[PDB]
Amino acid sequence: ATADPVKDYLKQIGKVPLLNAEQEVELAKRIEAGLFAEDKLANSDKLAPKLKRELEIIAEDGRRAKNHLLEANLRLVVSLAKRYTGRGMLFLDLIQEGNLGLIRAVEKFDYTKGYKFSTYATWWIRQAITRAMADQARTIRIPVHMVEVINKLARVQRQMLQDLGREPTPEELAKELDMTPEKVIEVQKYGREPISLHTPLGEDGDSEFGDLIEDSEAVVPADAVSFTLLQEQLHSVLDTLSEREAGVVSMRFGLTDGQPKTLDEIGKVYGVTRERIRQIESKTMSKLRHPSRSQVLRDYL
Amino acid sequence: LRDRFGTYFDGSMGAAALQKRLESFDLDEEAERLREIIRTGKGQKKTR
C-alpha cells in the first residue's frame, strides 16, 4: 500500500506462471468441462446429490481456471493498455477497461480452433480499450462512430501534411475523404478539447481564467428598471385613451390576460359584429400610431 | 486460513472492513478503558 497504485497493481500481478500451448489448452478443456458441469446442475432435472456435488466441484475448478487464465493474461492487457496511454485517459482506467474486454475474450474463446490465446484476445483488448476511450476520455462525450470519423480525418490530415510538406486545404481533404467540405469543417469543429477554468494567467496566481468571463443569465438592473417603467407607462397611456378603447385593446392584445382573445372570442361578451370590433381595433391602432402618444413608448422599444 | 478454517472468524478488506468494524464498535467502553489508563499511566502512552 504505497503511492502510485499502478506500481502496486503490477507487483500484485506478481510471479504468476505464464501458459504455454499445452497448459493453455488443458485450462481451456477444464473451462469447458466446468461450464458443462454448471450448465448441467443449472437444469431442473433430478440427479444424484453426490453427482450434483461433483458437478459443483467441477464448476469450482472451472472458475479457478477462469481466474488462472485471467491472471495469466493480465500482463498482456497491461502491455496493450500502455500501448494506448497518454491521450487524456489514465493508465489504470485503460488497464481495467481492457480487463473487461479480456473477460469478454475468455467468454468467447474456444479450443477447437488451433490458435494461441494472445492473437485472439488482442482484437478484443484493442476494441474495448478504444471503445472506452471513445466513451470516457472526452468530457463532452462523442459517439464511437464520430470518434472513428474524427481520428480517421486526423490521421489522413497528418499523412497529407507529411507528404505535401504543408497544411492541407480543407477542400482537398473533402475530395480525398469523399465528404462535403461543410461536413469536414463540422468534423474539425467537433474535434476539440475543453480548457479548464482554473488555468492561471501568469505571474499572479489568484487571478484565474474563470474570473475574466461574465455571465449572460445575470439580470441587468437597467433592463429590469426599464421593464418596470414600461409596465407603469403602458397602463398610463392606456388610461389616456377612452375606457372602452383601452378595455377592448387589453382584451385583444395580451396585457391584463396572458392569452390574447381573438375578435371572435370577444364578440360574445361584448356583442357586436366582427366588422365593428375590427374597425374600432384598427382605429385604436391608428390612434396609438399617432406621434403624440409615441415619445412615451418609442424609446421603450 | 479460509480453506482450512471456516465459520469462526469474519474477515473483510478495504473501507467495507472499517464500516463493519464501526457497526460493532462500542465507544463507551473504550472511553472507560482510556479513562482507566488515564488514572494509571506514564510516558508517551499517557499522552496517547
Binding site: A1 | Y8, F9, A15, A17, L18, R21, F25
Partner: protein, 49 residues
C-alpha cells in the same frame, strides 16, 4: 458500489484522525487501500468453548 472512506479523517493529525479504532496510520493505509485483510469479527467464546 462499494463504500469508501473520507480523506479528511484518515491521513491526518491525531486530533483529526483520532485513533478511534486502535490502528496505526500505516495500518489504516494498508487496510483501506486493499493491501491487507482485516478481521472484523471473531466468535471468541465459540472458539474457546
Amino acid at each position: 458500489a462499494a463504500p469508501v472512506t473520507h480523506i479528511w479523517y484518515f491521513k491526518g493529525v491525531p486530533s483529526r484522525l483520532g485513533y478511534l479504532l486502535d490502528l496505526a496510520p500505516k495500518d489504516l493505509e494498508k487496510v483501506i487501500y486493499f493491501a491487507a485483510y482485516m478481521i472484523t469479527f471473531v466468535d471468541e467464546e465459540r472458539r474457546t468453548r
